[PDB]
Amino acid sequence: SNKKTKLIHGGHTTDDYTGAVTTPIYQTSTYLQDDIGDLRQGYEYSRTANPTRSSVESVIATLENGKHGFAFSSGVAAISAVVMLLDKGDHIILNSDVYGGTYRALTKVFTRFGIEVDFVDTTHTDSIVQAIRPTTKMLFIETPSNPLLRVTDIKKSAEIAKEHGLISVVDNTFMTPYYQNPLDLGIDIVLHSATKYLGGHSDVVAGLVATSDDKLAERLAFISNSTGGILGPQDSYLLVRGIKTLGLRMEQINRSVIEIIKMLQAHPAVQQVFHPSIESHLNHDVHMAQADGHTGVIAFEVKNTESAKQLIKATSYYTLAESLGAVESLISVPALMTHASIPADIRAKEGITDGLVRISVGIEDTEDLVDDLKQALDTL
Amino acid sequence: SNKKTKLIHGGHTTDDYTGAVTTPIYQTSTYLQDDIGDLRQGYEYSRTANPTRSSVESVIATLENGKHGFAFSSGVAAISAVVMLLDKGDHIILNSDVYGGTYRALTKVFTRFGIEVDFVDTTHTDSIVQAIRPTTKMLFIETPSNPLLRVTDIKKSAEIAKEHGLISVVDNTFMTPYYQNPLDLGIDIVLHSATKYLGGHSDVVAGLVATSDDKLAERLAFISNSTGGILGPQDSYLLVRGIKTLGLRMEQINRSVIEIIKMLQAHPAVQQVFHPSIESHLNHDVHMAQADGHTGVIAFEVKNTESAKQLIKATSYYTLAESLGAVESLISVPALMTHASIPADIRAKEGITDGLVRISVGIEDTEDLVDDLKQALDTL
Amino acid sequence: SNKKTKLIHGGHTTDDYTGAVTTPIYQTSTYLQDDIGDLRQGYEYSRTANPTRSSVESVIATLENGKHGFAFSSGVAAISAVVMLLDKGDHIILNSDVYGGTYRALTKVFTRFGIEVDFVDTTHTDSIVQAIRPTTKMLFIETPSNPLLRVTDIKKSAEIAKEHGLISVVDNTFMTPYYQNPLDLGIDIVLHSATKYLGGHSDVVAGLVATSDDKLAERLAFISNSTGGILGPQDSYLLVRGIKTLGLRMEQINRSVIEIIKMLQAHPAVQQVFHPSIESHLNHDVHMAQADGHTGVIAFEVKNTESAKQLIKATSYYTLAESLGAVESLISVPALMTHASIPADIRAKEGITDGLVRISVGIEDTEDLVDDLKQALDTL
Amino acid sequence: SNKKTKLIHGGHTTDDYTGAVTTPIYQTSTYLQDDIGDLRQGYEYSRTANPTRSSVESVIATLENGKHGFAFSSGVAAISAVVMLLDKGDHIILNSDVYGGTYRALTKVFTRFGIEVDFVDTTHTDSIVQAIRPTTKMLFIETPSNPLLRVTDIKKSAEIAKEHGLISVVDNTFMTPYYQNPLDLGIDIVLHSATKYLGGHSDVVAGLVATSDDKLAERLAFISNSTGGILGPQDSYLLVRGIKTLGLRMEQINRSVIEIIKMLQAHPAVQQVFHPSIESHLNHDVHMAQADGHTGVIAFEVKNTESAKQLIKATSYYTLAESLGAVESLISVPALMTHASIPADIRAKEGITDGLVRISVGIEDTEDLVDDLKQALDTL
Ligand SMILES: Cc1ncc(COP(=O)(O)O)c(CNOCC(=O)O)c1O
Ligand SMILES: Cc1ncc(COP(=O)(O)O)c(CNOCC(=O)O)c1O
Ligand SMILES: Cc1ncc(COP(=O)(O)O)c(CNOCC(=O)O)c1O
Ligand SMILES: Cc1ncc(COP(=O)(O)O)c(CNOCC(=O)O)c1O
Ligand code: NA
Ligand code: NA
């Protein structure tokens, strides 16, 4: 049973009652009880459980080879729920190039709650060991990262976490369960911004979490019910729907990624390309050992900010917008958009050069995408 | 101008573009930018803002005579966002009768983050003054309370909070903006489980928050954006739709409440009755001075839990389920359902006895509701 | 038992499986079969049946005291389905004041299929008897009519239709089942533009049909299934939700209607007033004998079309738009908007003059609605 | 600009106002007018136009290389609207193996309206010429047909229709605009059951129509507005969404179709296979000349009804359900399901043998689909 089949038949996404081939949308808040505490299908209040959300949860658990799924109103909310597994005084290590909003949440919210943070370049696993204190309880890793796609050894970070008694969390958003399964490599918790590839259609903001640990799942459920950043039923339905085409979409995206990178490597206006598919990429071997495909986010550097802006205006099929994982291919300038608050000279130290472009490859025709970007690069 | 008109025309709930009479459902995650940083209507990512969510936010702000609305995935998520205004070491005062889940969240979650909580009988405002510690930063009041309907003097608690530098928060869920407007009495933040009267149809789980404080609004926006417990667009739409009928629904409910209370006060199988409309009810004067109506939540004592169970089975129009503020009239035993997370000995001390019944009066015919409940109580 | 209770508990609008208090939205097209021909709940293809559509159908059947409900994509589609009960050569009688689009559909579409139509002044039932041809198979009545609110004797027209073997159809859109129940007076089929009062929130375009005739129901089901103008599940859900508040909304509307009519009768810039509540209105006795209330549609004459235009601009709470039965109060000029498809000379003969204004009274405050309309008419 | 790009960027499917990357869902019934007849974006009533429906219409028009799109509540409703282009006395020719519901509508509804019908085996174009009377106004062709996939020469049928003054209609449902574009070959009107491949997710019942003829479009619009079988906004949104993945889905489906047919042709329990991809198939050359891909519906004959039933029970990834074009692969027995009313001996004359199986190939893994069906055929 291969992935494209599991996508279609994995999880519970039909109606046992009527036999509907799609998950009913339970736009509802409460459920009648036959007697006090006697729930006929286990439902009592939609913050606690909702049959549509339970459906999407079952899907994410199945695809990530876990036992328990959780759906939150945003990826940010999923991350918050996971971090609220810790107490004041606990210490968490994250990779240093973590997504802007994850950094913002750990440093201007959860530090105010007495949670200690260390940001570490996890491209070398031993930096994690250097960072481990006796109060360390959680290790949190994106791979690949935004926007330079730095790869981290998932299996090694799981071994480190196991031996030091840490909760290991991988943020699988850029790879999707279709290409990378952190739970299979020993990670405790895997989470996604379902806003991207999973939803797939730029029409749902949601986060998903999956684990095989029963006691971790029980704590996650308690947090979800007591802080309430749950995904609504309509968005859960749209998420299930979106996930159906995930394999086909990721494979189209990957075909275009490969051709686009060959174009970028051959082009003169491009000084450097960041993507784990490139054999000179740091930890390319590690990535190929922990995934059987690629993310569709690519970064490449052109000479300056005005060649970036000109590339944006010269493209016909790349769309200037926030986010990634859309059907549309998206384009952006991290120096002017996501990393604008970071000053110029320090963002050169960080790698966010003035001419760094990030594309999120969509499901348009591969030749249209390659050709369009190449003619734009020929205008420079 | 008048309340029933304000419900229809207050806030922005039409489409400027097409002239549509109802708020469009912007089931979307991202927005096109004309130039880098150039947003056509101020939208760039749906976690940050979404036109349908902004519609509901504008409605709740208008109705509570504040300046800023916020829509969360649940009332519990609104409460979480407000509590995250505090830091480790800060102390919060709440009133002694609180919704089960608010108690659970503050005592089993935010204490782990070093936030101190004390539950204080605010029916006498001066008890707040004694309870204020030097680390007290927030005062949080339900009024009337769930499930005993204890009244607290909102204007007095606002004066106290101003004089000691506390953020005053009122949880106006039971009264709705139709009858009670805490911001107009000096409160800093007003909160709702929009799951109840506002949504009105048992089909949306959501929270709403409103303030006139610009800097509190900015901190709330930062929290919502960094933890992501945002209300989705479909639920935001359904909330606006529901809020339209709010006045008509509350006025039916009040008509029915009056007759049901006279019935309960006269009935032999009914012991104590809890509702602020009763002249012997503690702080009844206070309630009539701060509200223009009554909540539809009523609590009353029967002899024991199995007389509760039999009363529940004998009713034909009261539905055994959690939550309140629906069109259906609802019935429950708070000790065994909504307030089970409150410890037993405290629930006995407070009066939330095993035979305490809570009804939420709906919009069915008043005579059907009175007769049905009375014929059922004649069974005991 | 009583109407306000029937609105809440009549029909099947809960989930038997999970106990959900609201009708699930079965956004689905097909259903699993356990064996060939073995349907788990009787569903096999969503054009034929859909559980959410069946929910709304059960509601309208219950409310109209019939046995069979039908949900169409629009009221016009319900009318089409009913007219398709006839064959080429059959003759239908309609009342002389009909909604613009019903006129357009019967005279510009179904005549091309050899269906003969005659518009007859049914305010005197005996005019029907003269109009009956040997090819007459159907009698079709709006009451009150759009936009002149002409009353027709429903019980008398049913007796006539029974005695001559005609299918009697009443278009109960203006009255709603809350106030008038044609099936209870012998009519065969009752029809609604559910777009109006039933939906209630200007957010659903839909039609509903109800009958107790088993064989008419079977022919209607065959027509709906073979021409496919079925109501979708999301709109069916929103219709159920809307119908919940129908009694409360109609009762507000009626309270406002009474005061607005006294204002209009007294105003100097207002000539004739059309509404069945007026004692001098033709067949006012008849209306009070067949209904327990009044529609919120009022028509009245101002001097000319530009006094209409100025009255429209001067109002603050009346909205210039098509349709009726919304929470917003609406205002229009039928001659130039809804009834423009009716030929001009017939519209002048009938009284649908260029200065005929139609308001649909909404649920805003009665005093705001009276004062606003009167201050605007003081402008002429 | 290749097909997979056109799918993503063809048509208007973003919000000009806010810049949302997806079509807003206009759950609304009416739109305010600035003055009488002055519509700010051309909208006045949602039966007439609705921005979400206008979006989907634009998509279908673009993909079929037409100028005008129309969205109906069902494919059946689209077909009815097209047939209502004719008048009593007009004559239409359809292919003899037309879909059950199209046959049912033409013969038990539209014949009652004086429309004459001839059902003709259009696999030889000259049978059309034999059938042409002087009253013939319309030619209506499915290709390939259900369930034996008979191919008809589209370009030739267009030439015949042009020379005899007929409205040519092709029912492109089985091929989708991705593989066959009848308008490009001279056909006047092309229609789809969007319930199948276009929607793609078994969650929308809808029909779509596309033409380049301005006067035909004007008539179609008049019919749509006066009979009202319009697609609702939520289903239009879901249709746009579904159409995004159409190319990827059709290509996966086609890869599996080819492998599955090689398996079926090689298997002993299979006596005969029906699919236009087979070179011995009647008019295979014609199909390859008018399409650049294949439908995913395949028929094959096994010995008897009990080998069909056993094949259904023995498969793990083929699902017994009505309809086609799902993500799930579907399986059925036409003799016992769609063609059950037709007697046994005459269905042998028709080709609907007792052992005829129809599969609708989904987007599961190709090897899982081939293997699963082959092991089932090895159980016979
Ligand atoms: C790992 C991870 N988690 C979370 C997120 C975001 O989570 P959420 O779904 O709440 O937006 C992102 C992406 N955030 O991008 C927004 C942008 O491109 O401006 C992400 O990469
Ligand atoms: C006063 C109050 N505030 C806040 C909340 C939290 O709201 P939410 O459930 O939307 O998260 C609730 C939730 N009540 O729910 C079940 C019940 O008591 O019958 C509440 O009652
Ligand atoms: C009495 C009546 N019946 C039937 C119908 C048809 O209903 P629908 O628009 O849902 O197809 C209508 C539609 N009215 O619409 C605009 C207006 O008159 O203000 C109607 O008024
Ligand atoms: C050409 C065509 N038009 C129309 C249709 C059906 O149109 P609609 O979308 O109204 O179902 C079909 C398929 N109908 O199948 C239903 C089934 O498999 O039982 C079709 O092939
Ligand atoms: Na399954
Ligand atoms: Na493990």
Ligand code: NA
């Ligand atoms: Na307004």
Ligand code: NA
């Ligand atoms: Na203030």
Ligand code: NA
């Ligand atoms: Na019922």
Ligand code: NA
């Ligand atoms: Na009868």
Ligand code: NA
């Ligand atoms: Na476009």
Ligand code: NA
């Ligand atoms: Na042409």
